[PDB]
Design a protein around this ligand. Structure first.
Ligand SMILES: Nc1ncnc2c1ncn2[C@H]1C[C@H](O)[C@@H](COP(=O)(O)OP(=O)(O)OP(=O)(O)O)O1
Ligand SMILES: [Co+2]
Ligand SMILES: [Co+2]
Ligand code: NA
Ligand code: NA
Length: 327
DNA sequence: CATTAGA
DNA sequence: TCTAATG
């Protein structure tokens, strides 16, 4: 956790560079299991060899580890940290809808910068087009102050469109979070569940709503169960307009909300931890359900949930306020 | 780990 | 269809 820090960090840098700049899935995949086990390691890694004893650590990594121990740096690392082509991918990559594939291809053609991107706005597709548009605002954290306002709005419409809707603003936001990255709205309705053959409009309707009034302003991608946009708070009696904000709306079969809802609320740790516990407690939990464990190894059989409660109850835990879903 | 675009 | 990107 800190005894093994710098080692794991360089390791992650290396890995990272492989998967992105180059296309070295293995090397890249290598760098991580390494960075994983070395991190589990309870003692101060004193040397290559020492590391080397590890599972996943070959001669190559060890070799780096030595140099890193030897001198606070790493050449290959300093070299990458330098290189423009590489630097460039790292950046272009920030643009929403720009992955590495595309990162590399752009570079290739010589689009290294943002400006470059603009001049060649033609080469960018709609998603990336928006990404480019809102580049600045896409990076900005969302203040809960704002979070509350947004949420208020969405809830309002959802309601008005259909009284039957059930919507949850999941994520950190849900968990107290002073800020948040984007807004995730968990949707479901009684007329949608496991079986009941869709009802795409169900999503469609509300989407429209939100756009209607100008809360949703763009569409990154909208499909039959997942919508992905950009929204924005009405810039008041002007002098101050609001930033463009990433926003996801997902339709859910009412017969799996709380699970999913549980799930999105997290934290990551609350998850796993709650997840590991359902196991002893004789269950299985995942993004949609909770199934009682059958001794023959596994077993199935979706347990019926009407609230986040139902789940804890099952695995007989203490009802944890989201607030304290932190770990 | 899955849903949407895209070409 | 495969392949990319976000989550
Ligand atoms: C996982 C964590 C959440 O349950 C969900 C993704 O929500 P996501 O927005 O990525 O994370 P988060 O809400 O914890 O962070 P934040 O809102 O700060 O970006 O899947
Ligand atoms: Co989020
Ligand atoms: Co999200
Ligand atoms: Na080894
Ligand atoms: Na990006």
């Amino acid at each position: 956790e800190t005894l093994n820090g710098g080692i794991t960090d360089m390791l992650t840098e290396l890995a990272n560079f492989e998967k992105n700049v180059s296309q070295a899935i293995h090397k890249y995949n290598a760098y991580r299991k390494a960075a994983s086990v070395i991190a589990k390691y309870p003692h101060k890694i004193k040397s290559g060899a020492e590391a080397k004893k590890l599972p996943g650590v070959g001669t190559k990594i060890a070799e780096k580890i030595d140099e890193f121990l030897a001198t606070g740096k790493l050449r290959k690392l300093e070299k990458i940290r330098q290189d423009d082509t590489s630097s460039s991918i790292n950046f272009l990559t920030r643009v929403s809808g720009i992955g590495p594939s595309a990162a590399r291809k752009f570079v290739d053609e010589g689009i290294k910068t943002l400006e470059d991107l603009r001049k060649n706005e033609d080469k960018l597709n709609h998603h990336q087009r928006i990404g480019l548009k809102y580049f600045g605002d896409f990076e900005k954290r969302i203040p809960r102050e704002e979070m509350l306002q947004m949420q208020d709005i969405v809830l309002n419409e959802v309601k008005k469109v259909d009284s039957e809707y059930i919507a949850t603003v999941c994520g950190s936001f849900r968990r107290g979070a002073e800020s948040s990255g984007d807004m995730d709205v968990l949707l479901t309705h009684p007329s949608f569940t496991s079986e009941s053959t869709k009802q795409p409009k169900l999503l469609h309707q509300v989407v429209e709503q939100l756009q209607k009034v100008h809360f949703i302003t763009d569409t990154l991608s909208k499909g039959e169960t997942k919508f992905m946009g950009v929204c924005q708070l009405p810039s008041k009696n002007d002098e101050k307009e609001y930033p463009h904000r990433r926003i996801d709306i997902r339709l859910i079969p009412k017969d799996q909300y709380y699970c999913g809802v549980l799930y999105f609320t997290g934290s990551d740790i609350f998850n796993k931890n709650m997840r590991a516990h359902a196991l002893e407690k004789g269950f299985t939990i995942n993004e949609y359900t909770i199934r009682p464990l059958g001794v023959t190894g596994v077993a199935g059989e979706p347990l019926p949930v009407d609230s986040e409660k139902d789940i804890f109850d099952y695995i007989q835990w203490k009802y944890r306020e989201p607030k304290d879903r932190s770990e």
